[PDB]
Amino acid sequence: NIMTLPKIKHVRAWFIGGATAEKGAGGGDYHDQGGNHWIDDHIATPMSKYRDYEQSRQSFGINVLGTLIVEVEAENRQTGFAVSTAGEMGCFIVEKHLNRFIEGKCVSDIKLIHDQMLGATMYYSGSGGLVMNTISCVDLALWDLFGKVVGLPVYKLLGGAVRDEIQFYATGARPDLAKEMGFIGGKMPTHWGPHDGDAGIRKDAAMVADMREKCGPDFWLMLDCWMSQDVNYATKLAHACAPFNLKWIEECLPPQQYEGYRELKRNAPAGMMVTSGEHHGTLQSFRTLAETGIDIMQPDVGWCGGLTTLVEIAALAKSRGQLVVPHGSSVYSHHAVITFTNTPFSEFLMTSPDCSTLRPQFDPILLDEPVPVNGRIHKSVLDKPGFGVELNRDCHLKRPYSH
Amino acid sequence: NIMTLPKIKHVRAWFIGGATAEKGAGGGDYHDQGGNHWIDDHIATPMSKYRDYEQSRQSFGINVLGTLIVEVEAENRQTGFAVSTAGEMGCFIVEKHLNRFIEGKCVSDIKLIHDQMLGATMYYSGSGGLVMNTISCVDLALWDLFGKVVGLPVYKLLGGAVRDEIQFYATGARPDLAKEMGFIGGKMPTHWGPHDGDAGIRKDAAMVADMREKCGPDFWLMLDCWMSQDVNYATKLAHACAPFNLKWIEECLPPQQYEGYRELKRNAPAGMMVTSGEHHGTLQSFRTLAETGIDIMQPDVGWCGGLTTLVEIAALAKSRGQLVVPHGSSVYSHHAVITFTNTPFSEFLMTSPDCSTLRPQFDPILLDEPVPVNGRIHKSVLDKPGFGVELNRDCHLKRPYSH
Amino acid sequence: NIMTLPKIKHVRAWFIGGATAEKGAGGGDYHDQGGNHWIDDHIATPMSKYRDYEQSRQSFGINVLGTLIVEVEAENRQTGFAVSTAGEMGCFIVEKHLNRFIEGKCVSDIKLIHDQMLGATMYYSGSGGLVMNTISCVDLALWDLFGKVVGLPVYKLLGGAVRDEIQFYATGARPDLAKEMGFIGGKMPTHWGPHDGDAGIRKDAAMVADMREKCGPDFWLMLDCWMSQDVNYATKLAHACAPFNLKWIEECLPPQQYEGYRELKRNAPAGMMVTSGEHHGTLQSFRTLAETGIDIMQPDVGWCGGLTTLVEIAALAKSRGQLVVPHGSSVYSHHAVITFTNTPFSEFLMTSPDCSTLRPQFDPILLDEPVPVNGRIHKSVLDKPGFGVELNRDCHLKRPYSH
Amino acid sequence: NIMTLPKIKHVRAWFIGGATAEKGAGGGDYHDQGGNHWIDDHIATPMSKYRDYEQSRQSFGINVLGTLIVEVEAENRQTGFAVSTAGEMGCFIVEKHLNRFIEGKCVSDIKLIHDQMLGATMYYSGSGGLVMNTISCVDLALWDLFGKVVGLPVYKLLGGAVRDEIQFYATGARPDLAKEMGFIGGKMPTHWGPHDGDAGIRKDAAMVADMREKCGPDFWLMLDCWMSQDVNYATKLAHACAPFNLKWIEECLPPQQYEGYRELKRNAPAGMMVTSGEHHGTLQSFRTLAETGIDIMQPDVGWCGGLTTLVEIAALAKSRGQLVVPHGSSVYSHHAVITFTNTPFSEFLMTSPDCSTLRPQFDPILLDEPVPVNGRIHKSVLDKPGFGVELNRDCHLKRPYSH
Ligand SMILES: [Mg+2]
Ligand SMILES: [Mg+2]
């Protein structure tokens, strides 16, 4: 007997953080942290070749957007929400543009609202980043509302778990500690780039050699290069780290450089994986990325288009026999990837400043947000309506636009 | 507040039709019809080069499987079902094999049960047909149960319609009549094959020229070749029909002939589409099919793997900018393709013996099964729990196995 | 002076084994064995990533089909037969469908009956497995009858041996023992898959290293991976086993994954072979497989289409300078591959539960069925009419259909 | 009960014709005819650009080899034979070389004797022509003996007809007449080459236009260019003949020019076929030829390696979805191609000097050699032991070697 579905009454967007509020706010922006966080400690970037912007990513402006929160209220007064990285500018997009497609549709009209946001912003989105972050947030807000309205987890709507539990590896400066917390592997940032030559390679390879000595042969080790390299540097580094069984090397190149990724994968040591995707948006970009022949694609659910895009990226990887392993986005990834046969493991990105505690991935912004206890999360944990979390409204949410 | 989901208590399979029951039974088998149906009237096939098997497809055995019905009963006693083409042999598969993966899981455990059926039958399925027909049926049975248990249409679970109504073209011997019923186009079978040479081409092209004269320039015309041709014959025919603006030419080759399809598409008249897919199964086969560069892929939802496979095929086509237009499978396609932005139209395959009435696509087996009135179906029509239909149990359902 | 050939009066099919008879029946189904057989001892499969279906393949349903026996009787009352893996469902296919093409033709009309079975089942076979197993059995039944009617071995009909004796390697858990029995090499199953990571690789590589130490440098060692891997896992494993001169690594991927096989072969250690084919059916699939550039194709004569298909696969491999080495199917392979210049060796798959005795490949079902004594079989052994064996009718053959 | 097979006692070779006997002898050499035959009437060749060698092919030496006859006698005194084009030099090869592999083997040892002849002559055969003509003759001689010894047609040994009758088109100067004799089509030689420019094209195209006017639209028309062209000339000519629906254009280029054939096929009018093969020998050459993507390959059974090679070429074409249509070689082709599903028609090459009578294809040399009455040959006609013919020993057979 037919469940009756509400319309959509209001869409609202606030921000915490970024260049118009409290720097260090955390939440949706992973890199809105304080001083002396691991995530800002001399990480190789495109900018790190410049001496002012070598030490800190925060210095070049990695923290200026902050968290976007987008909330959608049905006319039965029930809400759903999600968070992403756009902040005040993303509030403008939701509130001076996108609201015309959200407001007044059914709660179940998610794909249509998605297609309309894609169609309408195509002239100014191009292909990812700020606009697509905003689009993904709306998309996830919508899936939350719908799962709450129905009284079901997103993961059951999507057709159920294919695994009882999600396995995690941990991202950050301390694989040794993450091994003690029960994680399956650990992914470190690179600290030196192309401008540092062989000394850079020696230095980053030595950090891998050390953690192999510490963690032993079965715990996975990976390197994350945040767009900082070229093909030759990436190939010298992949080969330096080969004696230590580096599982994969990740995001070596700026996202436009599809032909670079093709060539990098051709030059990779036998058995070593090349990965990318976290700065890619749209299904069609990921088609192009997949066909470079890289092993694993890594959308951020909050950056790539949303859960709607992500399920399509997973199908596309699976048609090719490839894995999709999203760039860790808490419950949003969780409800997705527990249904994906081609996501055998997931990413926890340490928001703990020294990678010693299981601090929540989206802390403070998300209430009862789960953590990988013993680097695992059981399916029974996610068994809450929608995405299973609530908005910490104690947080100092600014609202620069309404309509 | 969390909806509580039942386990799965029993899976049951019956058959109507095929070589062990009533020939002409209709239902899940499209080609289990009587004498003097359009669908058996001198249609070109792989076999039609043999004089005993030229006149009738029924003669070579196109009707021996019959309908499979698969029903799944939750422990709250609620059921879901679907129908496909496997019959008694499909009953064996469900009841001596597949039941070990269905029975005792949650109603929402569809993808897992899917993966398990794929994994376990891989040594004997290969890649489509009988075993995959059975797999798809179970898969659709499961989605019905789940949508009924939740009290929602499959189409809303999947994230909503992207169109208010499905547009249909009509398949069968009478495009002129289908134009009067309000259909957007009409697809005729070919009647002659390679062994008939130029006379075959002349004859089939003349049937297109005639219906172009009758239907005028805006109503679409297509040809369906049921695996009957080779590349050269298909290219001569595509070129003969070009003056008449044939929209596409469909299934020219046996499904293994990926390289043939590549070559056919290369040789197609400018602007004319090449299509295939209805005898393909598994996501991975469709990856291979897509990369031949054909324009439209055409899974049957009941033959290709199920709704679970189909949503992945749609994502895969959409990553490439291609359409997916399923081989018409009533409500099963409907609830799918009303959510697919890259399915702008759908197929109605005339089960009416002379293509003059809107006889139900799966008649008699499906109760309150919708028809394209004015070659359209509104989204509001599909707004019933699950797939929105019931099993005509008046039908003479035989049960050759239990467990 | 012209030998006069009988028509074909009757085709009959029985079964031993599977989910409707005696589990453990042996015969045509290689994997219809008892408890504590090597062939079910923790073998890596697509399913072995699931904890219920890790330990046993029998648990996921690898044994549910059982043996098909198909017998064809000429009107002079002479018979021929063969066995394969389809059982009761294959009995339906022979007896409610295929009999219309077999019954009433000449005994020498094998290719025609073959083409007709392929043409007629194309809409439900797709490309291999259950239906194709049935087709192959009929095909081999026909060649037996014809060779018996003529009073010649299949191998002489095909144009004679190109070698005095067939050399064998042995498949199963004990290469060391097989070396003592005089076999040229030994092929072990893998036990761990992708979900077991580096520990899985270490474990399987250590089992190869051990048997290299035992068998020494001239006895061949191979690994068989039964569809269980992905490209990366297969490449790590191939490279791990390279120090030990693993001759080849076999069936790493599900049969649809042609592009995976291409990529795997590209990544293989220099000099190491990649093989597949045993789950492929139809000549055209094998064209696609061949062009991935794998080294050896491995049809099962009883699964791929039959002896008629196999001779075409051998020609196709030989045009490319590749070997064909069939997946061991006793006399059916023997009479074939003793004529193939591009099959310099053959497979014996141990049906002996601990790989210590030369138990017959198709035990119990085949009377006076030869064994590789000293891992050889001389051509003079095969010098019997037809395929040279008889049907053990003491076996408890069930007949679920007649016509 | 086992038929007992004789050894091989003697191999003997004679010749009629060529530069050491009676010019105009006919038989195995198609082009050993008299003055004023159609087959020597101003046919375009590689040599026809030279004014001495324009008018006659006989002038440049097309007739110097003559017929080879090779006869093999078993120790039960039974014989088999065949004919080809090598004459006295082919007698040397059989009698000073190849006899070491033929003499003393079993009658059924055909493939082995084949492989041994290929292996041993590889240093001087290269890849076809004179040596391979000799090899093919031996091969066919062997199949005749074996079919006679067994008392069966070659066609039944190979596994039976797939068609009740062979359809023929006719090759030579008079398609109009061949249409009256009941042939399905007619293939004319070209008369002008590249050195004749546009006038050559106009002239040959006008001869096709004329016979289209005469024969009407359903009777097939083809052009045979005997190695005489380049790619550009062949493409201008194919396009000139397109208005008249020329079915195919054949052997435009010298056999080495694989890349030329690739390019020619790319440039062919839509729907028009490109063919070659009659001067190709060995399976491996035909692999290379097939992959140019030409439509039809055309071995001569007596030139390409023999019936043993031809069955492999047919399998190789069929794996690709291509036809094989042998260059007409009477019973040798017949017993082959009546079993080939991918030879839907065959070639009759007019040995009648003005193409008005059904003169035997191998006249005088072959006794009771069938003709396409009404351009057909029924399977029942071929139903004689071996290849079904006898050696006209009235003919003046010279024996230049024994051993
Ligand atoms: Mg990253
Ligand atoms: Mg169709």
Ligand SMILES: [Mg+2]
């Ligand atoms: Mg194997």
Ligand SMILES: [Mg+2]
């Ligand atoms: Mg020619």
